[PDB]
PDB file of C-alpha atoms and ligand atoms in Angstrom:
ATOM      1  CA  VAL Q   3     -30.478 -22.811   0.890  1.00 52.13           C
ATOM      2  CA  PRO Q   4     -32.923 -21.006  -1.398  1.00 51.40           C
ATOM      3  CA  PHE Q   5     -31.618 -17.106  -2.295  1.00 51.89           C
ATOM      4  CA  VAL Q   6     -27.980 -17.202  -0.512  1.00 51.60           C
ATOM      5  CA  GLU Q   7     -26.723 -16.698  -4.118  1.00 51.80           C
ATOM      6  CA  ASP Q   8     -28.237 -13.612  -4.633  1.00 51.07           C
ATOM      7  CA  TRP Q   9     -26.760 -10.397  -3.679  1.00 51.26           C
ATOM      8  CA  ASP Q  10     -28.032  -6.551  -4.440  1.00 52.14           C
ATOM      9  CA  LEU Q  11     -25.753  -3.194  -4.870  1.00 52.85           C
ATOM     10  CA  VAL Q  12     -26.743  -1.430  -2.695  1.00 53.26           C
ATOM     11  CA  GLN Q  13     -24.118   1.438  -3.029  1.00 52.78           C
ATOM     12  CA  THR Q  14     -20.901   3.038  -4.960  1.00 49.66           C
ATOM     13  CA  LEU Q  15     -17.533   2.817  -3.546  1.00 50.06           C
ATOM     14  CA  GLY Q  16     -15.349   3.871  -6.172  1.00 50.15           C
ATOM     15  CA  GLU Q  17     -14.346   4.047 -10.140  1.00 49.86           C
ATOM     16  CA  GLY Q  18     -11.659   2.833 -11.701  1.00 50.60           C
ATOM     17  CA  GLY Q  19     -14.517  -0.309 -14.512  1.00 53.52           C
ATOM     18  CA  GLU Q  20     -16.143   0.928 -10.811  1.00 49.58           C
ATOM     19  CA  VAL Q  21     -16.451  -0.796  -7.066  1.00 51.55           C
ATOM     20  CA  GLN Q  22     -19.613  -1.436  -5.953  1.00 53.34           C
ATOM     21  CA  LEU Q  23     -21.479  -2.384  -2.536  1.00 53.44           C
ATOM     22  CA  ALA Q  24     -23.172  -5.614  -2.807  1.00 53.06           C
ATOM     23  CA  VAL Q  25     -25.429  -7.268   0.534  1.00 54.40           C
ATOM     24  CA  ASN Q  26     -25.937 -10.879   0.278  1.00 57.35           C
ATOM     25  CA  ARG Q  27     -30.037 -11.095   0.182  1.00 57.11           C
ATOM     26  CA  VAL Q  28     -30.479 -14.003   3.053  1.00 59.56           C
ATOM     27  CA  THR Q  29     -27.771 -13.465   5.169  1.00 59.00           C
ATOM     28  CA  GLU Q  30     -26.898  -9.754   5.239  1.00 59.17           C
ATOM     29  CA  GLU Q  31     -22.978 -10.595   5.463  1.00 59.69           C
ATOM     30  CA  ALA Q  32     -21.770  -7.277   2.785  1.00 60.45           C
ATOM     31  CA  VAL Q  33     -19.181  -7.691  -0.018  1.00 59.95           C
ATOM     32  CA  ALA Q  34     -17.070  -5.216  -2.560  1.00 60.26           C
ATOM     33  CA  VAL Q  35     -17.940  -6.117  -6.075  1.00 59.77           C
ATOM     34  CA  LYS Q  36     -15.473  -5.340  -8.504  1.00 57.35           C
ATOM     35  CA  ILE Q  37     -16.810  -4.422 -11.846  1.00 55.47           C
ATOM     36  CA  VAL Q  38     -14.591  -5.391 -15.324  1.00 55.30           C
ATOM     37  CA  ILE Q  39      -7.845  -8.465 -14.995  1.00 52.41           C
ATOM     38  CA  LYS Q  40      -6.824 -12.287 -15.205  1.00 55.83           C
ATOM     39  CA  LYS Q  41      -3.627 -11.843 -13.570  1.00 56.24           C
ATOM     40  CA  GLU Q  42      -5.814  -9.419 -10.655  1.00 56.99           C
ATOM     41  CA  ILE Q  43      -7.886 -12.653 -10.431  1.00 54.35           C
ATOM     42  CA  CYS Q  44      -4.948 -15.154 -10.034  1.00 57.47           C
ATOM     43  CA  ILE Q  45      -2.184 -12.897  -7.269  1.00 59.06           C
ATOM     44  CA  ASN Q  46      -5.788 -13.643  -5.435  1.00 57.11           C
ATOM     45  CA  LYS Q  47      -6.478 -16.551  -5.736  1.00 60.32           C
ATOM     46  CA  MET Q  48      -3.128 -16.965  -4.250  1.00 64.71           C
ATOM     47  CA  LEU Q  49      -4.382 -14.193  -0.520  1.00 65.72           C
ATOM     48  CA  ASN Q  50      -4.892 -15.200   2.401  1.00 62.52           C
ATOM     49  CA  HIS Q  51      -4.047 -12.628   5.165  1.00 60.61           C
ATOM     50  CA  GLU Q  52      -5.259 -10.692   7.699  1.00 62.33           C
ATOM     51  CA  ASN Q  53      -3.733  -7.358   6.596  1.00 62.94           C
ATOM     52  CA  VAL Q  54      -5.056  -7.909   3.119  1.00 57.70           C
ATOM     53  CA  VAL Q  55      -8.527  -7.318   1.867  1.00 58.12           C
ATOM     54  CA  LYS Q  56      -9.915 -11.175   1.154  1.00 55.68           C
ATOM     55  CA  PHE Q  57     -10.265 -12.264  -2.153  1.00 57.45           C
ATOM     56  CA  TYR Q  58     -14.503 -15.024  -1.921  1.00 58.42           C
ATOM     57  CA  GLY Q  59     -14.343 -15.391  -6.275  1.00 57.78           C
ATOM     58  CA  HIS Q  60     -14.719 -14.607  -9.221  1.00 61.11           C
ATOM     59  CA  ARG Q  61     -17.809 -14.707 -11.571  1.00 60.21           C
ATOM     60  CA  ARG Q  62     -18.141 -13.183 -15.596  1.00 62.41           C
ATOM     61  CA  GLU Q  63     -21.816 -12.643 -16.915  1.00 63.42           C
ATOM     62  CA  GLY Q  64     -20.215 -12.622 -20.853  1.00 66.72           C
ATOM     63  CA  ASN Q  65     -18.271  -9.837 -21.526  1.00 68.82           C
ATOM     64  CA  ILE Q  66     -17.919  -8.490 -17.747  1.00 67.90           C
ATOM     65  CA  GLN Q  67     -16.042  -9.871 -14.864  1.00 70.41           C
ATOM     66  CA  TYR Q  68     -16.951  -9.948 -11.764  1.00 67.12           C
ATOM     67  CA  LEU Q  69     -14.783  -9.653  -8.987  1.00 68.27           C
ATOM     68  CA  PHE Q  70     -16.165 -10.639  -5.496  1.00 69.58           C
ATOM     69  CA  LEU Q  71     -13.755  -8.476  -2.900  1.00 69.96           C
ATOM     70  CA  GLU Q  72     -14.011  -7.675   1.279  1.00 70.83           C
ATOM     71  CA  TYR Q  73     -16.221  -5.152   2.140  1.00 70.49           C
ATOM     72  CA  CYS Q  74     -13.765  -2.922   4.572  1.00 70.37           C
ATOM     73  CA  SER Q  75     -16.325  -0.301   6.322  1.00 70.69           C
ATOM     74  CA  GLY Q  76     -14.002   1.815   7.517  1.00 72.98           C
ATOM     75  CA  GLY Q  77     -12.900   3.196   3.592  1.00 73.74           C
ATOM     76  CA  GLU Q  78      -9.897   4.358   2.717  1.00 76.58           C
ATOM     77  CA  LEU Q  79      -6.400   5.105   4.821  1.00 77.23           C
ATOM     78  CA  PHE Q  80      -6.412   8.262   2.442  1.00 76.89           C
ATOM     79  CA  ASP Q  81      -9.449   9.691   4.112  1.00 79.61           C
ATOM     80  CA  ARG Q  82      -8.062   9.730   7.907  1.00 82.29           C
ATOM     81  CA  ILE Q  83      -5.067  11.422   6.890  1.00 79.90           C
ATOM     82  CA  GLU Q  84      -5.914  15.835   6.942  1.00 77.56           C
ATOM     83  CA  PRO Q  85      -4.767  17.281   4.827  1.00 76.33           C
ATOM     84  CA  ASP Q  86      -1.312  19.585   6.422  1.00 77.34           C
ATOM     85  CA  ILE Q  87      -1.499  17.329   9.600  1.00 77.69           C
ATOM     86  CA  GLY Q  88      -1.825  13.675   9.093  1.00 76.92           C
ATOM     87  CA  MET Q  89      -3.193  11.642  11.560  1.00 77.72           C
ATOM     88  CA  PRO Q  90      -1.953  11.755  15.680  1.00 79.09           C
ATOM     89  CA  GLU Q  91       1.593   9.630  15.839  1.00 77.28           C
ATOM     90  CA  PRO Q  92       0.088   6.287  17.743  1.00 77.80           C
ATOM     91  CA  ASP Q  93      -2.599   5.752  14.623  1.00 75.52           C
ATOM     92  CA  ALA Q  94       0.559   6.008  11.807  1.00 77.30           C
ATOM     93  CA  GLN Q  95       2.627   3.644  13.528  1.00 80.64           C
ATOM     94  CA  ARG Q  96      -0.204   1.227  14.314  1.00 79.07           C
ATOM     95  CA  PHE Q  97      -1.556   1.338  10.555  1.00 81.42           C
ATOM     96  CA  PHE Q  98       2.624   1.536   9.534  1.00 80.41           C
ATOM     97  CA  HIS Q  99       2.733  -1.625  11.486  1.00 83.05           C
ATOM     98  CA  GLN Q 100      -0.700  -3.149   9.660  1.00 84.99           C
ATOM     99  CA  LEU Q 101       0.970  -1.994   6.951  1.00 83.24           C
ATOM    100  CA  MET Q 102       4.580  -4.148   7.212  1.00 80.42           C
ATOM    101  CA  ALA Q 103       2.103  -7.168   8.035  1.00 83.13           C
ATOM    102  CA  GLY Q 104       1.030  -6.699   4.820  1.00 81.29           C
ATOM    103  CA  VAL Q 105       3.701  -6.439   2.588  1.00 80.58           C
ATOM    104  CA  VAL Q 106       6.136  -8.845   4.217  1.00 77.52           C
ATOM    105  CA  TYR Q 107       3.080 -11.853   4.032  1.00 79.79           C
ATOM    106  CA  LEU Q 108       3.035 -10.891  -0.399  1.00 78.36           C
ATOM    107  CA  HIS Q 109       7.103 -10.595  -0.399  1.00 83.95           C
ATOM    108  CA  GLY Q 110       7.053 -14.052   1.395  1.00 85.06           C
ATOM    109  CA  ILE Q 111       4.773 -15.676  -1.342  1.00 85.77           C
ATOM    110  CA  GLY Q 112       6.632 -13.594  -3.936  1.00 83.87           C
ATOM    111  CA  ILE Q 113       4.160 -11.103  -4.696  1.00 83.08           C
ATOM    112  CA  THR Q 114       4.336  -6.906  -4.942  1.00 88.48           C
ATOM    113  CA  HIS Q 115       1.932  -4.911  -5.183  1.00 86.93           C
ATOM    114  CA  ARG Q 116       3.730  -2.134  -7.162  1.00 84.36           C
ATOM    115  CA  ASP Q 117       0.875   0.590  -6.598  1.00 85.04           C
ATOM    116  CA  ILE Q 118       1.311   1.408  -2.273  1.00 89.51           C
ATOM    117  CA  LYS Q 119      -0.331   4.177  -1.625  1.00 90.80           C
ATOM    118  CA  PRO Q 120      -3.367   5.743   0.886  1.00 93.35           C
ATOM    119  CA  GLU Q 121      -6.250   5.254  -1.436  1.00 91.87           C
ATOM    120  CA  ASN Q 122      -5.332   0.990  -1.758  1.00 86.06           C
ATOM    121  CA  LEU Q 123      -4.860   0.660   2.004  1.00 83.76           C
ATOM    122  CA  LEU Q 124      -8.449   0.066   2.691  1.00 83.48           C
ATOM    123  CA  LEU Q 125      -9.975  -0.070   6.707  1.00 79.80           C
ATOM    124  CA  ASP Q 126     -12.378  -2.476   8.392  1.00 80.90           C
ATOM    125  CA  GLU Q 127     -14.820  -2.030  11.487  1.00 83.77           C
ATOM    126  CA  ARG Q 128     -12.325  -2.059  13.191  1.00 80.52           C
ATOM    127  CA  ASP Q 129      -9.838  -0.259  11.449  1.00 77.03           C
ATOM    128  CA  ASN Q 130      -7.745  -3.293  10.195  1.00 78.26           C
ATOM    129  CA  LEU Q 131      -5.507  -1.923   7.371  1.00 77.89           C
ATOM    130  CA  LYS Q 132      -5.560  -4.173   4.518  1.00 77.37           C
ATOM    131  CA  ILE Q 133      -3.878  -4.060   0.986  1.00 79.54           C
ATOM    132  CA  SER Q 134      -6.362  -3.493  -2.054  1.00 77.20           C
ATOM    133  CA  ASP Q 135      -5.906  -3.583  -5.616  1.00 76.70           C
ATOM    134  CA  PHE Q 136      -3.829  -6.450  -7.360  1.00 77.03           C
ATOM    135  CA  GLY Q 137      -4.799  -4.815 -10.903  1.00 78.61           C
ATOM    136  CA  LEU Q 138      -0.763  -3.909 -10.670  1.00 80.97           C
ATOM    137  CA  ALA Q 139       0.218  -6.455  -8.301  1.00 81.22           C
ATOM    138  CA  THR Q 140       3.323  -9.426  -9.836  1.00 82.71           C
ATOM    139  CA  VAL Q 141       5.621 -12.260  -9.483  1.00 79.15           C
ATOM    140  CA  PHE Q 142       8.401 -11.159  -8.928  1.00 80.78           C
ATOM    141  CA  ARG Q 143       9.980 -14.567  -7.345  1.00 80.24           C
ATOM    142  CA  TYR Q 144       8.875 -17.944  -8.406  1.00 77.10           C
ATOM    143  CA  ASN Q 145      10.858 -21.255  -7.605  1.00 78.14           C
ATOM    144  CA  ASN Q 146      13.233 -19.565  -5.519  1.00 81.47           C
ATOM    145  CA  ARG Q 147      14.826 -17.659  -7.948  1.00 79.44           C
ATOM    146  CA  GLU Q 148      14.387 -13.476  -8.739  1.00 82.72           C
ATOM    147  CA  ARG Q 149      13.314 -12.398 -11.213  1.00 85.40           C
ATOM    148  CA  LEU Q 150      14.551  -8.615 -11.567  1.00 85.02           C
ATOM    149  CA  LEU Q 151      11.529  -6.092 -12.536  1.00 82.65           C
ATOM    150  CA  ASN Q 152      11.470  -3.288 -15.814  1.00 80.48           C
ATOM    151  CA  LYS Q 153       7.985  -2.572 -16.358  1.00 82.44           C
ATOM    152  CA  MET Q 154       7.223   0.992 -15.410  1.00 80.54           C
ATOM    153  CA  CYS Q 155       3.945   0.696 -13.028  1.00 80.79           C
ATOM    154  CA  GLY Q 156       2.780   2.919  -9.616  1.00 77.35           C
ATOM    155  CA  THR Q 157       1.633   6.100  -8.665  1.00 77.65           C
ATOM    156  CA  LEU Q 158       4.559   8.936  -8.952  1.00 78.58           C
ATOM    157  CA  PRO Q 159       4.915  10.804  -5.720  1.00 78.53           C
ATOM    158  CA  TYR Q 160       5.128   7.011  -4.244  1.00 77.04           C
ATOM    159  CA  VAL Q 161       7.618   5.492  -6.894  1.00 77.07           C
ATOM    160  CA  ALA Q 162      11.049   4.654  -5.778  1.00 75.84           C
ATOM    161  CA  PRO Q 163      14.002   6.486  -7.804  1.00 74.65           C
ATOM    162  CA  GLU Q 164      15.153   2.882  -9.355  1.00 74.05           C
ATOM    163  CA  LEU Q 165      11.836   3.369 -11.214  1.00 73.83           C
ATOM    164  CA  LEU Q 166      12.770   6.075 -13.076  1.00 73.87           C
ATOM    165  CA  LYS Q 167      16.650   6.146 -13.554  1.00 74.01           C
ATOM    166  CA  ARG Q 168      17.572   1.938 -14.014  1.00 73.83           C
ATOM    167  CA  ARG Q 169      16.098  -0.543 -17.073  1.00 71.75           C
ATOM    168  CA  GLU Q 170      15.983  -2.613 -13.661  1.00 74.82           C
ATOM    169  CA  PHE Q 171      15.303  -2.720 -10.483  1.00 75.02           C
ATOM    170  CA  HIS Q 172      14.582  -5.679  -7.271  1.00 76.15           C
ATOM    171  CA  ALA Q 173      10.871  -5.655  -6.660  1.00 72.78           C
ATOM    172  CA  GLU Q 174      10.851  -4.852  -2.154  1.00 70.43           C
ATOM    173  CA  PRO Q 175      12.992  -2.349  -2.036  1.00 72.11           C
ATOM    174  CA  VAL Q 176      10.326  -0.371  -4.309  1.00 72.80           C
ATOM    175  CA  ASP Q 177       7.429  -1.385  -2.207  1.00 74.04           C
ATOM    176  CA  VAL Q 178       9.779  -0.835   1.061  1.00 69.83           C
ATOM    177  CA  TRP Q 179       9.928   3.265  -0.753  1.00 68.07           C
ATOM    178  CA  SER Q 180       6.111   3.861  -1.243  1.00 68.35           C
ATOM    179  CA  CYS Q 181       5.621   2.013   2.013  1.00 67.69           C
ATOM    180  CA  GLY Q 182       7.796   5.401   3.904  1.00 67.33           C
ATOM    181  CA  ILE Q 183       5.747   7.983   1.936  1.00 67.22           C
ATOM    182  CA  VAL Q 184       2.671   6.677   2.864  1.00 67.25           C
ATOM    183  CA  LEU Q 185       4.309   7.062   6.572  1.00 69.94           C
ATOM    184  CA  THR Q 186       5.602  10.103   5.807  1.00 73.44           C
ATOM    185  CA  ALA Q 187       1.404  11.549   4.477  1.00 72.29           C
ATOM    186  CA  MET Q 188       0.757   9.615   7.768  1.00 71.27           C
ATOM    187  CA  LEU Q 189       3.149  11.877   9.694  1.00 71.57           C
ATOM    188  CA  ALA Q 190       2.766  15.626   7.696  1.00 72.15           C
ATOM    189  CA  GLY Q 191      -0.989  14.592   6.067  1.00 69.42           C
ATOM    190  CA  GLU Q 192       1.567  15.787   2.632  1.00 69.96           C
ATOM    191  CA  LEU Q 193       3.626  14.223  -0.199  1.00 70.91           C
ATOM    192  CA  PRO Q 194       7.730  15.063  -0.349  1.00 72.82           C
ATOM    193  CA  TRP Q 195       7.841  15.468  -4.637  1.00 68.14           C
ATOM    194  CA  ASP Q 196       6.500  15.218  -6.997  1.00 68.63           C
ATOM    195  CA  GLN Q 197       8.354  11.887  -8.429  1.00 66.59           C
ATOM    196  CA  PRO Q 198      11.457  11.558  -6.594  1.00 60.67           C
ATOM    197  CA  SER Q 199      13.985  12.796  -9.458  1.00 57.16           C
ATOM    198  CA  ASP Q 200      17.240  15.439  -9.253  1.00 58.01           C
ATOM    199  CA  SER Q 201      14.765  17.974 -11.547  1.00 55.21           C
ATOM    200  CA  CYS Q 202      12.521  18.132  -8.725  1.00 55.02           C
ATOM    201  CA  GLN Q 203      13.357  20.402  -6.188  1.00 57.86           C
ATOM    202  CA  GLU Q 204      11.762  19.125  -3.235  1.00 53.78           C
ATOM    203  CA  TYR Q 205      13.859  15.494  -4.234  1.00 53.27           C
ATOM    204  CA  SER Q 206      17.323  17.211  -4.079  1.00 53.59           C
ATOM    205  CA  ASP Q 207      16.490  19.360  -0.518  1.00 47.60           C
ATOM    206  CA  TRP Q 208      16.007  15.981   0.822  1.00 49.00           C
ATOM    207  CA  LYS Q 209      18.792  14.273  -0.941  1.00 49.48           C
ATOM    208  CA  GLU Q 210      20.699  17.334   0.959  1.00 47.40           C
ATOM    209  CA  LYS Q 211      18.866  17.224   4.383  1.00 45.02           C
ATOM    210  CA  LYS Q 212      17.341  20.372   4.529  1.00 43.83           C
ATOM    211  CA  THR Q 213      15.112  18.526   7.382  1.00 43.74           C
ATOM    212  CA  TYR Q 214      13.911  22.284   8.307  1.00 39.78           C
ATOM    213  CA  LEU Q 215      11.693  22.420   4.965  1.00 39.79           C
ATOM    214  CA  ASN Q 216       8.286  20.866   4.777  1.00 36.58           C
ATOM    215  CA  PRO Q 217       6.964  18.054   4.982  1.00 32.61           C
ATOM    216  CA  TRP Q 218       9.600  17.122   7.209  1.00 36.93           C
ATOM    217  CA  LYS Q 219       9.537  19.944   9.789  1.00 34.82           C
ATOM    218  CA  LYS Q 220       6.416  18.511  10.978  1.00 35.92           C
ATOM    219  CA  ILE Q 221       7.695  14.543  11.827  1.00 38.11           C
ATOM    220  CA  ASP Q 222       9.178  14.038  15.308  1.00 38.05           C
ATOM    221  CA  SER Q 223      13.249  13.218  15.306  1.00 41.35           C
ATOM    222  CA  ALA Q 224      12.524   9.183  16.184  1.00 41.08           C
ATOM    223  CA  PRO Q 225       9.761   8.573  12.537  1.00 45.18           C
ATOM    224  CA  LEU Q 226      12.095  10.744  11.039  1.00 42.77           C
ATOM    225  CA  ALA Q 227      14.971   8.874  11.672  1.00 40.26           C
ATOM    226  CA  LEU Q 228      13.153   5.847   9.956  1.00 38.84           C
ATOM    227  CA  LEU Q 229      11.904   7.689   7.115  1.00 37.29           C
ATOM    228  CA  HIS Q 230      16.016   9.012   6.665  1.00 38.94           C
ATOM    229  CA  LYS Q 231      16.968   5.090   6.227  1.00 40.69           C
ATOM    230  CA  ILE Q 232      13.549   4.250   3.913  1.00 42.29           C
ATOM    231  CA  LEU Q 233      13.881   6.610   1.561  1.00 43.80           C
ATOM    232  CA  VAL Q 234      17.346   6.347   0.339  1.00 41.90           C
ATOM    233  CA  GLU Q 235      17.802   7.120  -3.319  1.00 37.82           C
ATOM    234  CA  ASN Q 236      20.426   3.407  -3.744  1.00 37.89           C
ATOM    235  CA  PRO Q 237      17.877   0.727  -3.692  1.00 38.16           C
ATOM    236  CA  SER Q 238      20.670  -1.578  -2.399  1.00 35.82           C
ATOM    237  CA  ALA Q 239      21.875   0.919   0.027  1.00 38.01           C
ATOM    238  CA  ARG Q 240      18.282   1.432   1.971  1.00 37.84           C
ATOM    239  CA  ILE Q 241      16.518  -0.702   4.810  1.00 36.64           C
ATOM    240  CA  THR Q 242      14.876  -4.302   4.010  1.00 38.77           C
ATOM    241  CA  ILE Q 243      11.795  -4.818   6.347  1.00 40.01           C
ATOM    242  CA  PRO Q 244      13.258  -7.382   8.990  1.00 40.79           C
ATOM    243  CA  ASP Q 245      15.772  -4.008   9.379  1.00 38.79           C
ATOM    244  CA  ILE Q 246      12.598  -1.469   9.950  1.00 34.18           C
ATOM    245  CA  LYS Q 247      11.350  -4.211  12.346  1.00 32.90           C
ATOM    246  CA  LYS Q 248      14.561  -3.804  14.117  1.00 31.77           C
ATOM    247  CA  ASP Q 249      13.952   0.041  13.898  1.00 31.77           C
ATOM    248  CA  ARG Q 250      13.617   2.635  17.081  1.00 32.13           C
ATOM    249  CA  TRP Q 251      10.323   4.391  16.437  1.00 32.15           C
ATOM    250  CA  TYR Q 252       8.962   1.223  14.735  1.00 34.09           C
ATOM    251  CA  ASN Q 253       9.595  -0.402  18.944  1.00 35.16           C
ATOM    252  CA  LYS Q 254       8.299   3.021  20.309  1.00 37.90           C
ATOM    253  CA  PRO Q 255       5.059   2.028  23.274  1.00 38.28           C
ATOM    254  CA  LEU Q 256       3.251   4.656  22.088  1.00 36.72           C
ATOM    255  CA  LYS Q 257      -0.576   5.532  23.487  1.00 35.44           C
TER     256      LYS Q 257
HETATM  257  C1  4HK Z  14     -18.306   2.488   2.638  1.00 37.28           C
HETATM  258  C2  4HK Z  14     -16.845   3.085   3.215  1.00 37.28           C
HETATM  259  C3  4HK Z  14     -15.596   2.757   1.709  1.00 37.28           C
HETATM  260  C4  4HK Z  14     -15.963   1.416   1.962  1.00 37.28           C
HETATM  261  C5  4HK Z  14     -14.744   0.939   0.589  1.00 37.28           C
HETATM  262  C6  4HK Z  14     -14.517   1.521  -0.180  1.00 37.28           C
HETATM  263  C7  4HK Z  14     -15.000   2.914  -0.327  1.00 37.28           C
HETATM  264  C8  4HK Z  14     -15.138   3.252   0.740  1.00 37.28           C
HETATM  265  O1  4HK Z  14     -16.324   5.111   1.422  1.00 37.28           O
HETATM  266  C9  4HK Z  14     -16.841   5.719   0.519  1.00 37.28           C
HETATM  267  C10 4HK Z  14     -17.300   6.530   0.857  1.00 37.28           C
HETATM  268  C11 4HK Z  14     -17.658   7.739   0.060  1.00 37.28           C
HETATM  269  O2  4HK Z  14     -15.611   7.368  -0.579  1.00 37.28           O
HETATM  270  C12 4HK Z  14     -16.164   5.952  -0.593  1.00 37.28           C
HETATM  271  C13 4HK Z  14     -13.251   1.458  -1.678  1.00 37.28           C
HETATM  272  C14 4HK Z  14     -13.968  -0.181  -0.328  1.00 37.28           C
HETATM  273  C15 4HK Z  14     -14.583  -0.593   0.209  1.00 37.28           C
HETATM  274  N1  4HK Z  14     -14.585  -1.838   0.594  1.00 37.28           N
HETATM  275  N2  4HK Z  14     -14.003  -2.995   0.069  1.00 37.28           N
HETATM  276  C16 4HK Z  14     -13.287  -2.155  -1.066  1.00 37.28           C
HETATM  277  C17 4HK Z  14     -12.399  -2.523  -2.342  1.00 37.28           C
HETATM  278  C18 4HK Z  14     -12.304  -1.691  -2.795  1.00 37.28           C
HETATM  279  C19 4HK Z  14     -11.458  -2.291  -4.053  1.00 37.28           C
HETATM  280  C20 4HK Z  14     -10.900  -3.402  -4.311  1.00 37.28           C
HETATM  281  C21 4HK Z  14     -10.164  -3.991  -5.170  1.00 37.28           C
HETATM  282  N3  4HK Z  14      -9.218  -4.193  -5.901  1.00 37.28           N
HETATM  283  N4  4HK Z  14     -11.157  -4.179  -3.080  1.00 37.28           N
HETATM  284  C22 4HK Z  14     -12.263  -3.481  -2.464  1.00 37.28           C
END
């Protein structure tokens, strides 16, 4: 059928290169086009899940790479978070369930995202959470053999303490930690510390269980009991996702 391959770039969605909203000339189907890499496309070709931004394909027009990705009309989770407030606890729980489904899927195929934050968690028309941007993502399991990580990747307020203290670390507890910081931000509208280091006063207060301070004071005891299990300094003692799925607040009916 003629012109079905032609796309009009209608609106800017973000900057990195850049992300533009493309509309099909014939079908009017909307897609996000990422203008820029080889690892990102390779990892994206492996992905197929309802809580992961869909990869439609790629095309190179010279030195420029075009990534055709799922357009998420609901925008970023970041913009659903009211500063210093957060969002209704039932909304945060539903987003947290969908975030866990996405992360279980990635870890199951041996992929770690390494930069989980509300800017990278997009929402479709029905407010379904989609994990976005696999530019920092890497394979941590291949031929059923786990590879320990050593590279500094991520965003300091969401990074796990072992990434700053240890030479090598397991990939999965790092993504679990960033998910707990996202959960904190959804329930309090603020990040608990600039970074998880002993030099950071806010981080020291948390390790000393001073939950009468912000952001913890704004969080109900049931989701706060979950955060006490996720934001554990020792990654070997940190709660795993199968155990998060058994948590009392995770399973609390909320309306
Ligand atoms: C119009 C709502 C909106 C949609 C979208 C975004 C951002 C959005 O918000 C706009 C509105 C003002 O600021 C940006 C960003 C975006 C969207 N769909 N897919 C993507 C998107 C972005 C990066 C990647 C990657 N890698 N994949 C998909």
